Structures are given as C-alpha cells and as structure tokens.
Design an enzyme around this catalytic site. Structure first.
Site, short mmCIF file in Angstrom:
data_model
loop_
_atom_site.label_atom_id
_atom_site.label_comp_id
_atom_site.label_asym_id
_atom_site.label_seq_id
_atom_site.Cartn_x
_atom_site.Cartn_y
_atom_site.Cartn_z
N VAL J 45 0.83 -1.17 0.00
CA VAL J 45 0.00 0.00 0.00
C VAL J 45 0.87 1.24 0.00
O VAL J 45 1.94 1.22 0.61
CB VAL J 45 -0.95 -0.01 1.20
CG1 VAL J 45 -1.67 1.31 1.31
CG2 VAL J 45 -1.94 -1.14 1.04
N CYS J 46 0.49 2.27 -0.73
CA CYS J 46 1.25 3.52 -0.73
C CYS J 46 1.21 4.01 0.73
O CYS J 46 0.16 3.99 1.39
CB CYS J 46 0.71 4.57 -1.71
SG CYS J 46 1.89 5.95 -2.01
N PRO J 47 2.37 4.43 1.26
CA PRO J 47 2.75 4.95 2.58
C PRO J 47 2.35 6.44 2.69
O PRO J 47 3.10 7.29 3.17
CB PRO J 47 4.25 4.74 2.63
CG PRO J 47 4.68 4.74 1.22
CD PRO J 47 3.57 4.10 0.46
#
Ligand SMILES: [Cl-]
Ligand SMILES: [Cl-]
Ligand SMILES: [Cl-]
Ligand SMILES: [Cl-]
Ligand SMILES: [Cl-]
Ligand SMILES: [Cl-]
Ligand SMILES: [Cl-]
Ligand SMILES: [Cl-]
Ligand SMILES: [Cl-]
Ligand SMILES: [Cl-]
Ligand SMILES: [K+]
Ligand SMILES: [K+]
Ligand SMILES: [K+]
Ligand SMILES: [K+]
Ligand SMILES: [K+]
Lengths: 162, 165, 165, 162, 165, 165, 165, 165, 165, 165
Positions: J45-47
C-alpha cells in the site's frame, strides 16, 4: 548412607555399671566411638550381639574406643535389664536410653511404624566422622570380632593416610 | 481439652495376665474405658497410682469398665516390670505399650521433649466419647477413689438423661 | 493438655464482693491460682460446684491461693446471679466475665458451637505454670476437697524439689 | 537406612564374562542378590574387595545368589578394566555401569559432590527386601567371607522364621 | 450497610413469655421482623428502649410484625432478667440468646473487642430483605414510635410499588 | 543456544601428559579455549574426532588456543584409555573428567537419560565468551578443519572490530 | 455497622449557597456534622427529605451542627438542581459531589450495581466519631424531627457522661 | 542444546520465488529440513551465507532437503531484499518472516535484548528430530559445504542404523 | 488500544428525544455506531463538541450511523441538561447515563481519580468492531467533520476490501 | 487509553536523513513530540499517511514538534525503504526501528499475534504527557492536517491555561 558424615549433637541419659550419666556429642570428641543400636530391651532372644560386644569391651577400651549401646527404651529400663539378664549384666559400657528417638533419627535409624531402632552399628572417629556402617534385619547377628577388624583398619588409615 | 470428643482409632500391643494381646479402638466400643497414662516403667517411685487402680479393678469390671494403662514403653518392658514389682504384679488389666507415641498423641498427651506421656486419665463411654479428664504434674498423685466416683456419676447421667450429680 | 505450660496474658472484668474490678495475668504472678471455668450463670442446676469451692475459700486463702471462676457471661450477670442465688452469694472470690471468650480460648476450653466454656479447673503456680487440670462433662461434678488435696501436693512438691506424694 | 525396604526398579547395561547384557529389577526377582558398589574403575589400588568377592563367586552361585558390582562408570569401561587388570579379569559376575547414577541413588549411595558411589554392599532376598547393609570409608576393606556369613544367616532365618 | 440484603440463616435459643423456644430464619419467612440488638442484660441503665418496644408490641403484632431482641447473653440470663426487671417483665416478644455471636455477626453488628452487640435495629420484610436500619451510641435512644412509622411506610411501599411514602 | 554468553565457574580433574591436574575457569581466562565434549571413553568406535583435534593441536597452541576434551568419565579412565588406544595416545591436551556432570550441565550439554555428554564443541574467547557452537547426533562427525577455520575467523574479528569474515 | 468509628479523610467539591467550595474532614473537626446521602439529583420524586433537612437547618446551626448532603453526582449538577427545583433552592447547607464514590464508600454506603449512594444519614461528633446511623430503602422517608432529637440526645450525653435516667 | 529433540509446531508467512506462502511444521513432516536463522535483512555485510546456501540448493533438493531461512523481519522485507540484492536474488528456497519471534523462540534462538535471531543452523530429519546444530557469533561465517557434509552423514546414519561416519 | 476488538455487552439507561430508554449492545448490532464520551454535564464550557456532533446527526443517520453520547452522569441529569442548555437541546441522538462507570470502563476510558470519562470517541462497525479511536485532553476539541470523513472511509473499506490507492 | 499519562523511557536506533542515530526519551524532554506507529515497511500500500506527515514536517518543526515514525522493523530496513519508495524518500524525520517491540508496548500498541504495531499516533508535550491519541484500522487514513490542528490547539491550551480551544 551416612558414611563419611559428621554426627549430630545429642543429649541423652544412660546407664553404665550401676550409675546414671549424661552423654552428649561432646563426650565423643577426641575419641573413637561405636554406636550400637538395637530394637528393644527385655525381648526373649538372649542378647548375644550386646553380650558379644561386651566380651570385646576391655580390648575395646583399648586402641581407644568408647561404646554406646542405644535403644528407644529409657535408661531406667536398661538398669532393670542389667539386673535381670545375666548377659546384659556383663555390660560395662554406657547404655543410652533414647525415648524421644532423636539419637536414633540422628543416625536415620528409626523404624517409624514401630518406634524402635533398626540393628545398626556406627563407627565414629575422634573428629565425629562415621567411618563404618553395618545394618541387619532381625535374625542376622552382628559379629563383634569383625567390628574390631574394621575399627583397627579405620585407625590405621587415619594414622597412615592412603 | 479433648472433653466430649470421640477417641481416635488405634492399634497397640499390650501385656495382660501373662500374655501379649492386641488392643484397638474396636475393643473399647460398647464398653466404658479408662485410659491411664503414666511416664515410665521401672522408675524408682513406687507405682502407687497403678496399684491403686488395680485395687479397684474388681469393682470397675463389675461396673463394665475396662482399664488400660499406657506408657511409651514396650509391652516387653511391661511384662518384665509386672514380674519384678510387687505392686505392678497386682495388675490384671491390659498394660499397653506405645513406643511410636501414636496412642499418646491421639490423646494429645505427649511431653514432646522427653518422649514420655504426661500423667493423664481419660474416661471414655460406650460411644467413644471422653467424659472425664484428669492431668497432673509429676509428684501430684491421682486418687483412684475420685476416678471411681466420677465413673459412677458418668454412668448415672448416661442412664438418666437431663439430670445431674 | 496444657499441663506444665505457662498461662497467657489476659485482661478481663470481674465481680468480687460487691465490686467490679479488672483482673490480668499480672495479678496472678507470685501467687497460686485456681481458674474454675463453668458453662453459664442462671441455669437451673444448683451451682454446687461454685458453692463447694466457696466453702473452701477461707482455707485456700490461708494457703495463698486465689480463686477465679470464669464463664462467657458478663461481670454484670455475675453480680446479678450473686444477688439472686443464695449459693452464689457465698462467693467471696473473683467472678470473671469472659464475653469475648479470650480467657476461655487461652485455656483452650471453649465449646465453639455453643459459645460457652467447658467444665475445667486449672491449678497455676506462682510462676504461671499449670500443675493440675480437671475437666468433666455435664452431670459429673467436681469435688472441691480433691482440688485442695491436689493443691497441697502441688505446694509440697514445689517446696521439696525431687519428691513425690 | 534402607534395611528391610524393597529395592526400586532399574534398567542398566553391564559387562559379564565377555558379553554386554541388560539387568533390570526383574532379573533379581526370585533370587538372592548382592549389590556391590565401589567408587571407580582404574584407580591404582588393586581391587582386592572385587577380587575377594570373585574368589567366593562359585561358592556364591551356590546357595543361590547373583552378584552385581556397580560403579558410575560405563559398561564400556568395565570391559576395558576386565582386560587390563588381572584381578578384575577373575570376575565372572555382572559388572553394572551406572553413568546416570540412578541405581546408585536408588540405594541412596551417591557421593553427590563426586559423582561416584560409596563403598556399600546390599543383600537382597528373592522378594526384593534388603536384609543386610555394609558401608565403609576409603581404606577400610570389606571381607567377602564375612559377607557370605550374613547371607547364610539371612537364608536360614528366611526358611526357619524366628 | 446491609440495606436491601437478605438476612442469613440462623438458629438460636430464646426466652419468650415464660418458655424456652428455638428461633430460626424459617420462623421469619412470610413475616415482617424487627431484630433489636443491645449490648447486655443486667446493666445498670433502665432498659427503656426494650420497654418502649414492649409498649408497642400489641400494635406491632396487629401489623403482623414479630420482634426479636438480641444480645450475646444466654436465654437463661434473659429469663432471669425478665424476672428481675419490672421493665423487662413487660416483654412478651422473644428474647434471643446469641452466646456464639453468630446472629450478631450475621448482621455485622459485633463489637469484637467486647463480645457484645452494638445498639442496632433492623427491619426485615416477608422476603427476608432488610428495609430499614438504625444504629446509635449509648445514650441516644431508639424511639419505638419512629420505628412504627418506618414499618408502616415500609408496608405501604410493599403494597403500592412505584410510590414513595 | 549459549552463544555470546560467558562460561560458568568450574573445577575438575583431568589427565594431561602422564599426570593428573586440576582445571578451573581461572585456567581459561585470558586464553582461547575449545571445550570438546564426547559421550564416552572406550566405546568401540575409533575416537577419530579426538585424534583429529590432536593432529591440529600444535597449530592451535601456536595460536594461543587451549583444548579441553570432556566426558562424564573419570580422569582415571582417561589415563587408562590414553594408555590403551593408539589414537588417544596422541593427545597432549587436557582430558577432563566430569563424573558429577557439573561441567557438562554448565554448557547445557547433558543427555539426561544416559548420563553422557552430547557431541558438542564450544569455542571460548579470552573474556570467557562462547563464540562458536557445534553439536551433532551420534554418527555425524565433527571436522577439526572447520573448527580451526572458525577459531581463526573468531580471532580475526576480535582483532579487527566491526569487520566480518 | 460503622457506629463509634472515626470518619475517614476526604476531599470533595461542593455547591454551597451560590458558590463552589472544597470540603475535607478538617472542616468537620470541632463541630457536629450530619452526612446526608441520597441516590441522585433530578429524579422526579419531590426531594422532600432534603427540603425537610433544609427546614431544620437554621435550628441545626444554632446547635452548632453542619449539614453535608452527598450524592455521586458532581457539584456542577448540584448547582443546576439548586436552580431548577423550588425544594432544592431552599438548601443553604453544602451539597457535596462524590463522582468517584470515595466519600460514599468511606461510609460503606454505595449501591455498587447502581453507582449511587443508599439513603443513609450519619451523625458525627466534634472528634469525628459516628454516633448515630440511619439507613432506609426507597419509599421509607427519613424524619428530620427524629434526627434533631437524636442530635440533641447525642450532645447531652457528650456533655453529661453517664447520667442516664 | 536442542540436539535430538523434536521441532515444535509453527505457522509463519514466507516469500519463495515470487510468491507469498504459509509454512507450518506439517510441511516439514516426511522431509529433511534446514532451518537457517540470521539477524536481519538489509544490513551492510554481503549476505554470503545465504547466497552460499543458495548455491547448494539444487544439490540439496536432490537429497530431498528443504531449506528455510529465518529472521524476525516480515516476508514483505524478504521480498524487497530479494529484489534489491543480487545475492539474495539467487535464493529459490523459502524466506520465512518471524516478526512475532515465535519460530525463533521455538529453536531457543532469540537475542532478547535485540529482537533478532542468532546465527544458528538446525538440521531436522523426516521425523522432526534435530540432528545437527551450528551457531556462531557475528563475523564467523557458516560454510555451506560443511553443512552438506553433515546432511549426507545424517542421511547415511539414518539409512544404516548402527554405524558412524 | 482497543482498536480492532469487539465492544463488550452493556445495559444502560439513556435520554432520547424527550424519553428514557434502555440501550444494550444488541441495539448496535447491524449498524454503525459512534460512542462519544465526555467528562460531565452542566459544566460552564459551551458543549461545542456535542453540538458539533448534533449538527452532523442528520447526515450521520443518512449514512446509517447511530450516535450515543456517554458520561458518568445519570440519564436524569441528561434530561435536565437537555432542557437547560440551548446547545444540548439540539441533540436528538441518545444520551447514555453511566453512573456505575461499567460502559466507560468497557472502553477503558475512565479517569479513575475523577470518576469521569476521558474525551474519547469510538467508531464501531455493524459487527461490533472498533475501527477508529480518538482521545484528547481538555482544550483540544474533536472535529465532527473529521469524524464523518473517517466514518465514510471505514464504510468504503468495508465494502471495497483492499482496494487501496 | 493512555491519555494524560507520561511516556516511558526508551532507547531505539533510527534512520534519519541518511544517518543512523540513537533516540531516547531524553531527546523528547523539553519538546513537542509526535509518535507515529505503523504496521510494517515495504507493504504494497502507498505509505501516504507517512508522506502526508512528511509534507507537513517543515511546518511542524517551526512549531517545535519532532516526529518519530515507528514500526517493529529495523532501522536497516527503514534505510532500504527510504531508498526504494519515492514517498518514503520525502521523509526527513527520524524512522525508529523497534525490533524488540518495547517502544510499541510502552504505548500499549502491539498486535501480539502479529508482532506489528497498530496504526496509532500520539502527541506528547514538553513534560512527556500524552495530550492526543488517534488510532485507526487499515484503510482509514490519518489526516496530517487534523494532526496539525490538534497540536496547535494543544500548544494553545498549554500557554493559556483554563481556556479551551
Ligand atoms: Cl546410614
Ligand atoms: Cl485434653
Ligand atoms: Cl488442657
Ligand atoms: Cl542405607
Ligand atoms: Cl448495617
Ligand atoms: Cl548451546
Ligand atoms: Cl454502617
Ligand atoms: Cl540449541
Ligand atoms: Cl483504546
Ligand atoms: Cl492508548
Ligand atoms: K520407648
Ligand atoms: K456471652
Ligand atoms: K561416569
Ligand atoms: K521485526
Ligand atoms: K456519577
């Protein structure tokens, strides 16, 4: 077993050649001691084991060993037995009474379900170290001469290390 | 005290009239019993107390009262004492030997330092209930007459409930 | 039993000849004491035991013996009983009230399911050592004369170390 | 002491006249047994006690007694010693190895600070009851003839109660 | 406090109108009960609180309320007091003896250092539920009139839920 | 595992070049040590592993590395094995006897069912820290070459902190 | 009960006559105090008990008695109730908020399954000793007149020790 | 050590050739397993040990041996490392993530003050029995060739019961 | 924190839109719930947080979200506050009273030294799983708009599992 | 929750702007701190939550606020991720590694069955007191803007006591 351990402190009453005395661990310090336990006074087998030891007692005052016989009877009873049994009458060593069983338990020699000591003999050196142990069931007598052998051997080794 | 409590099971050897018998709490059920403890056989005091009970044994037996003397000595020692002392030779009741101290401790009567029983008397009824206790220090004597009087009073109230002496 | 043990500290209120006082183990030190326990005041049995001891109090006082009767009733109840019962009125010794039961439990003499003391008598010497114990079930009276005999023997032995009566 | 008690279960490896075998309490059931404990193999005193027992072994297969010598060494070590010592070579009875010390502790005969057994001998009857005990400190030898006396006496009493 | 808890099981002897009876929690089931505790019988203060309840006993019985006075004295002592105090003589309700203190401790009402109960009154409904509690130090009398009022209010609420009196 | 932990104090008897010596953890302080455990002396497998270490002992000594073989056998048994086996006769390093099992348990290396040590090797640095451990089941042999390589790597990183092999 | 025990330390916020103040046990020292507990503010029953106490406040203040009403509501809620209810608005004594229940539990007065205090009143003397306790179930009102009577009797006994009629 | 004991049940996620999978002790049953623990992913030392084992994986797969590398990092980190490091990219065996440390603690291989596993390798047979253990401090590399040798010897002994290499 | 755990069973009284009702965990099943805790009713700070939630209630109801505000005050107090405060009067969601603190402690949200709940908001999904938690000290307001955002994101994720951008 | 409690002592390694550093509670003393926890590095998942905080880092530093992101991965892994994710590359605040989980458990924020921290943010004032807490399930983003707002409100209250923002 208790082999090579130090005897524990004790204070008991005893009968010896007509007189009542006190015996403590202090009376053994500096001497060789033989603690001779037996079940009870006045039973009907003639006490040949006690008498056999008596025969060797002179020779036992000796090479320097005191003899203390022990049962859970009182000293009062030992005195009586000494006057009733011609065999017991030969005894010139101290007859210790151990009604509380503390001496007997010190030597882990009590038959707890009976309140009597087992037939065990212990040899204690001047420093209070048990050097020989012998225990037998009823009917298997202890030979005093043989006791003497062990004691002499015990004494040699102690004055001739190794 | 142990008053009004039930005696505990036990199993000992005793000397009674030339022989060796075994006594258990079973022998006391259904009967009146006197447990007479004393410190030791062969002491130099004349066992006046034990002989005194012997003197009343006939009447006690007539009243259904058994007697058991107890000491931490063995039954072997009792046999010898019975055959050495004039007083002890008068005894026809069981002379219990309690070398394990179990019987003596059941009655919480041990001088734990000396391994001997204290001078105590216990009166036990047919149901095993302790109805009278007497304990005295060395030198203070127990009067068998007083014991006998108590037993009679005990038997009376058992027979006549809600009535006292 | 408690034979040959030392009595414990205690502090209780009591009725003695018209007055309320406090009694503690300190009042027993240096004297001979008789602790006479009984179940309860005002029951319907004539309290012959207490009156019997009262009859011998004069003589006991000569021997330097103090008497303390004890029940779990209060000192107030003892006072009342002392004024209603002609037998109790004879009592000139201290009637100790033990409502908390601590004195009674000291002598391990409590019937816990009843909250009352058992019929026990204890003889205590000047050093607080119990020298005689007597306990009986209901209906089995205590003879005061036998108590005196025991006290005299106790005094003898104590003054003639190494003798028995 | 352990006098008059029943021996405990055990399973050990042993060396006997060239072969490795297993010994268990089951192998003693129905026979008279002698458990002969000693400190260690290969020390420099010639083992006269073990040799003395060997001399009496024939006579010991006997009146019906098996002999089991015991030390905390392995059976492997006993085999080696049996081939190195002319005295040990005389041994025809089972040499039990007790590396875990369980047999030794069964007989309450362990010197815990050393990991070796004390010099103790036990005589066990067909029902597994110890009838005689002998323990000695280093330097005080055990006489095999005397062992035999006790065993004979033990046997008599057992077939002639009282 | 014990408000709104259920009374515990109990079995005590009591003195009631010339007779000795037994009282248990089973006797309270289905009824309104008043447990009236007091320190001791025979003290020197007039027993007016107890007498005050006695004056109202008739009326309380009409309301179906039983009254049990309780102290740690015995029932034997209550009988004696009932014959000695003209005020206590007015009492026709049960005087419970609590020598073991179990009834007093059930209501958490014991002065442990004295062995006597505190001056506490508890009102118990037919289901064994405490509905009113009153406790006072010596000298602060408990008013029987106020007690009656509370009981009537308690009886009202019980027959007319969700309404306060 | 015991990796990166410090060895525990110990005191054992050992056989080293015809004599009996005593080894303690004091002898290992300041030195590199190899504790080479094995199950038993005199088994019928050729002690190839022990001889293999002997073969590298000269180089180990040159590198400041002491070696101690350990078994639960006595030092008496080690002396005999040393004089009976061609392979064992090549050993010049101490042969520790651990009959109490203490040393073996210090290294958590006991087969508790058999009373023998497992086949484990431990490399200990001058500060007493375990830097390499190797344990194998019966039949799986330990390669002295691998041990030597490890010791060299261990000594290297000790000399060149924050740098690895 | 808590009869004859000393109140415990406490620190609570309260609403008093238009202001928020702090109350602690130190504010009770040297005075007669009435701790009046009730379940909750704002219920729909007319708060007649509080108003009744309010009616007698003047007179209680003449006798040197302080009044603290207590509930587990906050002092914030007491202020609001004091402005919404005509009966509560007459209150000039301190309204203590006990949200943590520590004051209520000090007096052993919490209904744990509800988080509210029981209807209990305690009278505390200048030395912090509880001299009277009253607890009732819902529907059974507390009479302020009876409270006043008790407080006067308490003050009398305190100034005229054992002068009972 | 854990030598000759059975491995414990475990369930962990892992990265193996592009895929995320689950691994449990059940996947080891009936096979030879190598559990290769190491401290952490992404450190700056070339992970020669892991790559060295990868070089021998083909040959190990021929011998029916599975390889599981283990660190307390997640499987996500292993995937990332497998794509950044050319050495790690060679790995075709499962890289187990042990963030909870349960696998590591199963093999008693956790450095608790660091939250990382020690450098330990364990060889497990088809029955879940550990047959070889190797542990080293940082800087002391593990030789994969020596691992293979040990595995072959382990397989021999297992197929030739009662032999040693 | 309690994140991702299931709410516990509870039974409380509440004020809702002119009525007193009961609320239990069963009323939350199948719905999205917001549990909004606050310290106390009637303080002098404008209750902007509750009013802010009130402003968004319509909209929350469209999203199928129920709102329960909670304080340790009673429901009786909530009714009063709802009639005195213009900001609280806009509230149409349920105002739960938690006098025992059991609801507050279920959410681990009690300030024990105060008896009040901390400023915490919890978002609970149809299955009773806590999906968002927010707690702040006094002075740090909770933004209803931010709450609404979180609730929409929670609903999205729940209907579109791992569809992250 | 932990609201208003003091953070505990801790010592962790971290990655910060190209360097490895040590962080302890001593580094937070006298400053405003944000502890930002997240499950793991390298997930797919994008941080963005971390990136969102990074976007606001400048402004947070002006307000004197330090930011510490925390996961149970090592600092080595944070470094790798910072070079792999263009979003993580924007991070100039400290990335703390918590492999032992002690920092995570200090804040009671560990998912024990996973060995990963929950998505929790804590705001800590100069005296080490937690003033705001935010926890969310996966998918429910934490808004850095809302975080900033809370910090400003927290800073306001701290410089203007007895006023809420
Ligand atoms: Cl012995
Ligand atoms: Cl008794
Ligand atoms: Cl007694
Ligand atoms: Cl033995
Ligand atoms: Cl109460
Ligand atoms: Cl290890
Ligand atoms: Cl109370
Ligand atoms: Cl291991
Ligand atoms: Cl939480
Ligand atoms: Cl928290
Ligand atoms: K005896
Ligand atoms: K009483
Ligand atoms: K050995
Ligand atoms: K980790
Ligand atoms: K409240």
């Amino acid at each position: 077993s208790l082999i090579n351990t130090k005897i524990k402190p004790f204070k008991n009453q005893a009968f010896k050649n007509g007189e009542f005395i006190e015996v403590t661990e202090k009376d053994t310090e500096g001497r060789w001691s033989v603690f001779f336990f037996y079940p009870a006074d006045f039973v009907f087998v003639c006490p040949t084991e006690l008498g056999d030891v008596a025969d060797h007692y002179e020779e036992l005052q000796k090479l320097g060993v005191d003899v203390y016989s022990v049962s859970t009877d009182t000293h009062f009873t030992h005195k009586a037995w000494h006057s009733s049994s011609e065999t017991i009458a030969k005894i010139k060593y101290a007859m210790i009474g151990d009604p509380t069983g503390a001496l007997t338990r010190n030597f882990d020699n009590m038959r707890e379900d009976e309140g009597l000591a087992d037939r065990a003999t212990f040899v204690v050196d001047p420093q209070g170290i048990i050097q020989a142990i012998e225990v037998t069931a009823e009917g298997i007598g202890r030979d005093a001469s043989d006791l003497l052998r062990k004691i002499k051997a015990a004494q040699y080794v102690a004055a001739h290390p190794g």
